[PDB]
Design a protein around this ligand. Structure first.
Ligand SMILES: CCCCCCCCCCCCCCCCCC(=O)OC[C@H](COP(=O)([O-])OCC(O)COP(=O)([O-])OC[C@@H](COC(=O)CCCCCCCCCCCCCCCCC)OC(=O)CCCCCCCCCCCCCCCCC)OC(=O)CCCCCCCCCCCCCCCCC
Ligand SMILES: CCCCCCCCCCCCCCCCCC(=O)OC[C@H](COP(=O)([O-])OCC(O)COP(=O)([O-])OC[C@@H](COC(=O)CCCCCCCCCCCCCCCCC)OC(=O)CCCCCCCCCCCCCCCCC)OC(=O)CCCCCCCCCCCCCCCCC
Ligand SMILES: CCCCCCCCCCCCCCCCCC(=O)OC[C@H](COP(=O)([O-])OCC(O)COP(=O)([O-])OC[C@@H](COC(=O)CCCCCCCCCCCCCCCCC)OC(=O)CCCCCCCCCCCCCCCCC)OC(=O)CCCCCCCCCCCCCCCCC
Ligand SMILES: CCCCCCCCCCCCCCCCCC(=O)OC[C@H](COP(=O)([O-])OCC(O)COP(=O)([O-])OC[C@@H](COC(=O)CCCCCCCCCCCCCCCCC)OC(=O)CCCCCCCCCCCCCCCCC)OC(=O)CCCCCCCCCCCCCCCCC
Ligand SMILES: CCCCCCCCCCCCCCCCCC(=O)OC[C@H](COP(=O)([O-])OCC(O)COP(=O)([O-])OC[C@@H](COC(=O)CCCCCCCCCCCCCCCCC)OC(=O)CCCCCCCCCCCCCCCCC)OC(=O)CCCCCCCCCCCCCCCCC
Ligand SMILES: CCCCCCCCCCCCCCCC(=O)OC[C@H](COP(=O)(O)O)OC(=O)CCCCCCCCCCCCCCC
Ligand SMILES: CCCCCCCCCCCCCCCC(=O)OC[C@H](COP(=O)(O)O)OC(=O)CCCCCCCCCCCCCCC
Ligand SMILES: CCCCCCCCCCCCO[C@@H]1O[C@H](CO)[C@@H](O[C@H]2O[C@H](CO)[C@@H](O)[C@H](O)[C@H]2O)[C@H](O)[C@H]1O
Lengths: 65, 66, 103, 486, 159, 274, 55, 57
């Protein structure tokens, strides 16, 4: 006879603890990919308008134009 | 500008009364209910009101007679 | 807030307790008067005594008062600073433009 | 799949659905015909904020003691009410359109969403047991613990305010009720009843032609004695009014009713005379009934129940705790106010009490079968189908929750019920090992209800005394002894 | 169906189980001693680390410093080899009216100096030997670590 | 064409600058949690404490993070965001303004809709005529011929109900504007002094030297900036919460004394009598 | 529609930069990072003491 | 000065900043809640029901 208040795991018991850890440390991993991307996005950037600029960069979002 | 809670009564001062469940002995008051055909006539009057206020869409009036 | 708050509280208590004193003085018999019999058929009294009822009836009464009369009140408040102002004549529509034969 | 498997029987199910609707209509007509002449009027009452109705079983859950109905017939009534609740997705095409058939497909996918007609079984007991073991125990087993936690955190409060909100005398009982899945020891229902110490004294004011009088055990005993004597009404009312004036004098000597000195309630004094209406020293104006002599004190037939639930009241529970209680009891909960879910809970409670009354009329629990008792305990939400208990344990569990629901308090009922739904899963396969002792067995005798139990002092818990060790236990338990030996 | 004599067998079984548990759980992991885990404790010292393998260390009264001597103030970390053991010495609470300095062989010692510990002459050696602290040269104190009484649960009496 | 109504949206560097603010919250890990716990338990006691607490935690930690990125991570928007009025009015003040209305919105709404039925509040209201006036006439006051002016009455009573919720908005706006002005004017004045000193030294190259020191001046200015802005942020938070207490949370003071129960093991019921 | 004009494409060279003053560089708060990186590293890695033997 | 401007009062760029910030906050709430308290360890370790037996003799 088995011990009481014990059972096998089920899908609604959620993920295991190791899986919760693997979920937690994904932002910490993407940090290493995004902070260099932040610095590159700032460094490889160019201003959009000048005193001589006859045009300004336009971005049609929905292709209506 | 404007008032404060310190200058006003509370949500416990207003609504200070807790709940009390009233009960009354049954003498037979909710017996021998009349007007057994009331809801039939009410539904009839409701449907009559809907019929007199009904208007079907007649697109044939837009036909190119000209 | 102002320091006149206790003054206004005294005046409110005065009018309230004097009205209650009046009701005590006149005593019973109000239901036999004509005022009560008209208030029984008066919609202002129905609305005013339904406001304080429970079941969201305070919200219902306030929102109904808003939807009915408070819009006109907002317009009135907007028009208080419009009544004194010079306005031009109304360009009344000639009701000639718009007619067109069907085809 | 199950979609086509249920579509195959969908034609054969409509006839059974309509037959069940006819049975429900007849049964409700009969029951309401009885209720409209024997039951009192429980008036609707609004919460402290006075915007939504509030409901309590003491006033609204009435038990027809003398209901000429079989227990299985009442089970059919309740189960078909739930089937009427489950038939609601049939309205989706009639409100959304021809594309409102995919909701009906989702409805027909799972058999647990469906009513009785889609089941192959015939007996109502086997059908209910199938539905539970397939869908209902699993749905309840994933709401039980989080409801237990919400009840805990409702008592102890949020954000580290236990020193301001909890009581230091109910502490050991609280621990035994909420942390018995740590020890593995059984629980005593009286320790769950100790949770009512958070509340005040529940009172019952009888309204008379002069003043309200607080009901007591003595007055109730006298009224039961007079009712049992079966006297003429001219003597019955006289004795009732004699006891009433006696109790009135008793409470007037006590210092008035308990309600006078309770925050949130109160009895007004005589009204004041304002200004010139004040006649010298008489600053008051007594009511009309002061003219009536005290010897003419008669009961109006009106009653006011006051639970005085300052921490337990269902109003203060919240949006989440009520929904989770209805999930745990397998009731409808979505997209409704807490007042409507309160009414649903009170109706379930009334059903369980009526079922208890009919079982007691039919000869208690022992007259029932094993499957019937299993289904009853599933309805009471004290058993999960992955336990396989004994008959004595099932009977003791039923007795426990029956006495606990006799007190008419959903909070302690849920606290008791949720303790039987704390199951764990091990990360290893070898562990837990196969036990060596037999299964846990009990009897109706092991439940101590006929004896009082004082609250254990904090950090000074006392052991559990069996009822048999008490004096005259063979005399007190003689009814249960005769029922078990027979 | 369970007599009372069969109970102590079950009790023996459970005692065996809990003893197999407690003999493991009685063990605990001590403090970490890996130098790679604590090298930054020395990196972050208020003074740079002295990799000392030559010369001598001497205590002499406070005042003028001999030119060429490396002061060893409180907080100074010194990587050395002592009796074949690579070690780090952290200076703590030098006595008053006195100071400690590393004197390379090129540096002449002053008067009234006391050689606390010295190194041998091994210029051709690739792996230096370091020092040899004899009994009486250095008083090394091992912590006592008095193991207190094992927490015993009170046995209740049975008449 | 006629139907084409065209609108221009000014879009810049938002995505990559906003991601790292949330990503830093795992590093900070709510260091202000203890302070806000202490303050909330000082100012209010209810079951819904945790809600408002969490809200305030989020707002405050966002403020702190933005401030530190404004001091250290100087790129693009992180410099302007504290010098801009929209951030100080909507990114910090609006959340704190709507937080109690989101936690205790039920009670406040019911209170307001009851205050539209304006009436005089009596302590120990054992009066009977008060009740008859409140039911029959609707109010203690005389409501004769106010329907004649009901159109204004509605809105005026509405303001009369929210007048004790309006100073919270006023204080939030005031302290947001204060923080904006503080940051902007102090930065501008400091930069102006720097530019005048550099003009003096460029015109006098005997002085165009690191006259205080390369690190001395920088460390001192770092300390000055961080100390001043820490004082200002502590002020804005402490005052926001103290005024939250004194303006909105004194409404919710409902102290219940503990009453001992006696009828634990027996309850009177409808079946006990009927 | 989407555009990518040539006005934004301009010559770039570090030689054309005006630069910063000594005061502006001190106000740039780089020297504070320079000090406080080492400060916080020292505090963190010095809070955790290792075992030792007292000589 | 530049920040003294009515254009910077309802700046849509900062409104987008706030939008993206709090959408990401909402996405990452269940990871912020993943800190462990050791209170139930204490309750398990220190909760000791009365284990004494009844003995009439
Ligand atoms: C778009 C326009 C479309 C127009 C359509 C019109 C035709 C379609 C339908 C016809 C209407 C039919 C009648 C009907 O529906 O009655 C419903 C309802 C109940 O009628 P009843 O049957 O007579 O109720 C009797 C008892 O209440 C019965 O008691 P009960 O126990 O059975 O249940 C009571 C429960 C009602 O039970 C239910 O009805 C269930 C509802 C769910 C199912 C849907 O509670 C209520 O009574 C609701 C009262 C509302 C006031 C209470 C406070 C609400 C607070 C809201 C949250 C906080 C607000 C923000 C706070 C921040 C600001 C400070 O009546 C209403 O009051 C409707 C009000 C709906 C709007 C509420 C919005 C609140 C938030 C406003 C924010 C401020 C902006 C506004 C200024
Ligand atoms: C969509 C699904 C619709 C189906 C109904 C929704 C679920 C059923 C439900 O909500 O019960 C109705 C709810 C009953 O709540 P309850 O279950 O009895 O809980 C009361 C407990 O005591 C309370 O227990 P608790 O403490 O555990 O629950 C607290 C909970 C209670 O709150 C709730 O009840 C939320 C319930 C969810 C509602 C779903 C809304 C989804 C919106 C998307 C026909 C309507 C026509 C009018 C439309 C325009 C209003 O949270 C709150 O107290 C805060 C609520 C307010 C949040 C929003 C505040 C926005 C503030 C904006 C700033 C304002 C600044 C200006 C300040 C001015 C100066 C003062 O009653 C109503 O809200 C009115 C009933 C009829 C309309 C309901 C739907 C629209 C109004 C909401
Ligand atoms: C107003 C509300 C006043 C009364 C509130 C009570 C109530 O409505 O009960 C709903 C009720 C919730 O369940 P319950 O009453 O708590 O009892 C659950 C049982 O104990 C069993 O509990 P369980 O744990 O076994 O769960 C059963 C399971 C399975 O439930 C099922 O029975 C089968 C699933 C049926 C899905 C029907 C929703 C379809 C949504 C549209 C999808 C697109 C259609 C096609 C394209 C168009 O539940 C679900 O998976 C989801 C159920 C909720 C679906 C959302 C229903 C929307 C109700 C409308 C009011 C809320 C929005 C405001 O929904 C149902 O379960 C039956 C279907 C209800 C059909 C009602 C038709 C009227 C719909 C009016 C639409 C309003 C839309 C307005 C926003 C747009
Ligand atoms: C963004 C993150 C996701 C958004 C989800 C929000 C859900 C909204 C909702 O359900 O309202 C019902 C909810 C009350 O519903 P309930 O009666 O307590 O029942 C809960 C559901 O039945 C419980 O859900 P359920 O257990 O019945 O599961 C079925 C449900 C769940 O499925 C879904 O709803 C979405 C499916 C995709 C996700 C599935 C992931 C697994 O799908 C449905 O069939 C019904 C949903 C329609 O309303 C609220 O609690 C209020 C929160 C939203 C208002 C907050 C303030 C909004 C801003 C106000 C602006 C103006 C202020 C001035
Ligand atoms: C971690 C960091 C911490 C911080 C550390 C501190 C770091 C210090 C950073 C300093 C950075 C700023 C310094 C200023 C540079 C500004 C550059 C700039 O953007 O403006 C361009 C700027 C444009 O000015 P402009 O208004 O157009 O007029 C300039 C011309 O007058 C007319 O315009 P032009 O375009 O017709 O130019 C004519 C011609 C000037 O016309 C002439 O006078 C011709 C004479 C110059 C050529 C002489 C070459 C032969 C040198 C002798 C070799 C001796 C060793 C041989 C072995 C002997 C053995 C015994 O221009 C040049 O030649 C430019 C000089 C370039 C260097 C020499 C030629 C090599 C170019 C190929 C590169 C080879 C790489 C070598 C390996 C590098 C390894 C690192 O041009 C210059 O910068 C040239 C000015 C002289 C250099 C600046 C000297 C500083 C000021 C006075 C001395 C004070 C310091 C003395 C210390 C002692
Ligand atoms: C028409 C006059 C309008 C021009 C000035 C408005 C002054 C209103 C005078 C009415 C006096 C009645 C009491 C009152 O309004 O209220 C008088 C108010 C006090 O009102 P509150 O206590 O409600 O704030 O006194 C003041 O402080 C402002 C008036 C200064 C003079
Ligand atoms: C709007 C119609 C209300 C009719 C009414 O009885 O009106 C009743 C009310 C008076 O009610 P009270 O005397 O009870 O305050 O009349 C008014 O306030 C003026 C309404 C305009 C009447 C036309 C002039
Ligand atoms: C206890 C001290 C009491 C005295 C208080 C003195 C006022 C101090 C105000 C501190 C706040 C000033 O805020 C600070 O302003 C400076 C000056 O623009 C900004 O500095 C920035 O702009 C300057 C202006 O040229 C650039 O040169 C510099 O490279 C850049 O960092 C800082 O990024 C900002 O943090």
């Amino acid at each position: 006879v088995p011990v009481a208040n014990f059972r096998p795991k089920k899908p609604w018991d959620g993920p295991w603890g190791i899986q919760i850890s693997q979920k937690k440390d994904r932002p910490f991993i993407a940090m290493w990919i995004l902070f260099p991307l932040l610095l590159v996005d700032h460094l490889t950037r160019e201003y959009y308008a000048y005193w001589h600029s006859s045009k300004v960069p336009v971005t049609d979002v929905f292709g209506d134009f | 500008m404007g008032g404060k809670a310190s200058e006003a009564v509370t949500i416990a001062f207003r609504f200070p009364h807790r709940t009390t469940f009233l009960v009354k002995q049954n003498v037979g008051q909710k017996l021998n209910k009349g007007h057994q055909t009331f809801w039939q006539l009410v539904a009839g009057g409701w449907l009559f009101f809907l019929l007199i206020n009904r208007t079907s869409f007649k697109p044939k009036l837009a036909a190119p007679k000209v | 807030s102002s320091p006149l708050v206790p003054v206004w509280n005294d005046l409110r208590a005065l009018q309230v307790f004097t009205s209650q004193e009046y009701m005590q003085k006149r005593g019973p018999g109000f239901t036999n008067t004509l005022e009560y019999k008209l208030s029984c058929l008066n919609p202002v009294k129905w609305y005013d005594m339904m406001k304080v009822m429970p079941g969201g009836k305070a919200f219902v009464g306030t929102a109904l008062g808003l939807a009915l009369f408070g819009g006109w009140g907002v317009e009135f408040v907007k028009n208080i600073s419009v009544m004194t102002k010079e306005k031009p004549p109304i360009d009344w529509n000639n009701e000639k433009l718009g007619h067109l034969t069907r085809s | 799949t199950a979609v086509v498997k249920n579509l195959a029987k969908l034609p054969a199910a409509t006839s059974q659905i309509l037959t069940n609707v006819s049975k429900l209509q007849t049964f409700h007509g009969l029951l309401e015909e009885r209720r409209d002449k024997y039951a009192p009027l429980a008036y609707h009452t609004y919460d402290n904020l006075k915007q939504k109705t509030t409901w309590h079983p003491i006033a609204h859950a009435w038990v027809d003691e003398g209901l000429p109905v079989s227990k299985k017939e009442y089970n059919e009534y309740c189960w078909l009410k739930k089937d009427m609740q489950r038939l609601l997705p049939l309205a989706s095409p009639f409100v959304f359109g021809i594309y409102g058939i995919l909701p009906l497909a989702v409805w027909l996918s799972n058999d647990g969403y469906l009513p009785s007609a889609f089941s192959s079984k015939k007996d109502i007991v086997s059908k209910k047991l199938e539905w539970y073991s397939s869908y209902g125990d699993d749905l309840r087993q994933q709401v039980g613990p989080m409801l237990q936690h919400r009840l805990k955190r409702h008592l102890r409060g949020t954000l580290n305010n236990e020193h301001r909100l909890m009581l230091d005398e109910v502490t050991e009982s609280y621990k035994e009720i909420f942390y018995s899945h740590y020890t593995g020891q059984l629980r005593d229902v009286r320790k769950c009843a100790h949770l009512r110490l958070y509340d005040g004294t529940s009172t019952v004011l009888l309204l008379t032609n002069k003043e309200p009088v607080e009901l007591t055990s003595e007055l109730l005993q006298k009224w039961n004695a007079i009712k049992a004597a079966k006297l003429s009404p001219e003597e019955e009312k006289k004795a009732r009014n004699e006891a009433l004036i006696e109790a009135y004098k008793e409470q007037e000597l006590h210092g008035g009713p308990h309600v006078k000195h309770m925050q949130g309630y109160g009895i007004p004094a005589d009204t004041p005379l304002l200004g010139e209406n004040a006649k010298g020293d008489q600053y008051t104006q007594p009511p009309e009934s002061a003219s009536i002599p005290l010897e003419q004190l008669e009961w109006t037939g009106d009653t006011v129940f006051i639970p005085a639930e300052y921490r337990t009241e269902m109003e203060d529970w919240g949006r989440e705790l009520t929904k989770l209680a209805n999930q745990f009891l397998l009731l409808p909960w979505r997209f409704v106010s807490n007042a409507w879910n309160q009414r649903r809970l009170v109706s379930w409670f009334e059903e369980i009490l009526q079922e208890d009354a009919l079982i007691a009329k039919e000869g208690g629990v022992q007259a029932l079968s094993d499957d019937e008792l299993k289904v009853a305990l599933l309805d009471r939400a004290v058993i999960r189908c992955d336990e396989e208990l004994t008959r004595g344990d099932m009977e003791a569990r039923y007795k426990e929750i029956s006495w606990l629901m006799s007190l008419r308090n959903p909070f302690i009922v849920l606290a008791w019920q949720t303790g039987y739904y704390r199951s764990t899963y091990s990360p290893e396969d070898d562990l837990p090992e196969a036990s060596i002792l037999p299964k846990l067995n009990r009897t109706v005798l092991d439940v101590d209800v006929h004896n009082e139990l004082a609250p254990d002092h904090p950090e000074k818990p006392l052991p559990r005394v069996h009822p048999a060790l008490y004096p005259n236990s063979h005399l007190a338990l003689a009814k249960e002894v005769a029922v078990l030996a027979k | 169906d369970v007599p009372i004599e069969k109970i102590p067998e079950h009790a023996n079984v459970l005692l065996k189980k809990i003893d197999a548990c407690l003999e493991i759980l009685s063990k605990d992991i001590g403090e970490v001693t890996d130098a790679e885990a604590h090298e930054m404790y020395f990196e972050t010292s208020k003074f740079q680390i002295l990799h000392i393998y030559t010369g001598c260390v001497a205590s002499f009264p406070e005042g003028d410093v001999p030119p060429g001597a490396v002061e060893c103030l409180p907080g100074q970390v010194i990587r050395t080899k002592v009796n074949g053991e690579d070690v780090m010495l952290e200076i703590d609470e030098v006595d008053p009216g006195y100071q400690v300095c590393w004197f390379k062989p090129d540096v002449p010692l002053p008067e009234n100096a006391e050689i606390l510990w010295s190194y041998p002459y091994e210029p051709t050696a690739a792996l230096p030997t370091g020092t040899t602290w004899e009994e009486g040269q250095a008083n090394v104190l091992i912590p006592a670590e008095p193991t207190p009484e094992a927490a015993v649960w009170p046995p209740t009496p049975v008449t | 064409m006629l139907n084409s109504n065209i609108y221009i949206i000014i879009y810049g560097g938002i995505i990559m600058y906003s991601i790292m603010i949330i990503i830093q919250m795992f590093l900070y890990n709510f260091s202000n949690k203890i302070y806000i716990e202490v303050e909330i338990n000082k100012y209010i006691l209810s079951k819904n404490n945790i809600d408002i607490y969490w809200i305030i935690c989020n707002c405050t930690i966002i403020i702190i993070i933005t401030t530190l990125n404004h001091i250290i991570n100087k790129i693009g928007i992180y410099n302007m965001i504290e010098y801009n009025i929209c951030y100080w009015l909507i990114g910090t003040g609006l959340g704190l303004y709507i937080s109690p209305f989101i936690v205790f919105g039920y009670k406040f709404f019911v209170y307001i809709m009851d205050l539209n039925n304006y009436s005089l509040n009596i302590y120990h209201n054992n009066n009977k005529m008060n009740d008859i006036q409140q039911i029959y006439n609707g109010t203690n006051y005389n409501d004769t011929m106010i329907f004649f002016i009901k159109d204004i009455n509605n809105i005026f009573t509405i303001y009369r109900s929210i007048n004790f919720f309006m100073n919270w908005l006023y204080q939030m706006i005031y302290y947001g504007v204060r923080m904006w002005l503080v940051f902007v004017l102090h930065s501008f004045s400091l930069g102006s002094f720097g530019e005048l000193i550099t003009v003096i030294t460029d015109n006098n190259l005997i002085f165009n030297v690191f006259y205080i020191g390369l690190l001395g001046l920088g460390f001192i200015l770092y300390l000055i900036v961080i100390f001043y802005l820490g004082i200002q942020i502590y002020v804005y938070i402490s005052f926001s919460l103290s005024f939250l207490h004194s303006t909105i949370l004194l409404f919710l003071v409902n102290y219940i004394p503990h009453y001992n129960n006696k009828s634990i093991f027996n309850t009177f019921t409808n079946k006990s009598i009927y | 529609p989407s555009t990518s004009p040539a006005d934004k494409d301009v010559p770039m060279s570090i030689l054309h930069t005006h630069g910063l003053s000594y005061v502006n560089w001190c106000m740039s708060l780089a020297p504070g990072l320079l000090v406080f990186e080492g400060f916080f590293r020292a505090r963190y890695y010095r809070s955790r003491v290792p075992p030792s033997r007292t000589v | 000065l530049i920040p003294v401007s009515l254009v910077d009062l309802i700046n849509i760029n900062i409104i987008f900043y706030i939008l993206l910030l709090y959408t990401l906050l909402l996405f990452f709430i269940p990871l912020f809640l993943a800190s462990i308290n050791y209170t139930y360890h204490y309750i398990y370790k220190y909760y000791n029901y009365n284990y004494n037996f009844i003995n009439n003799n």
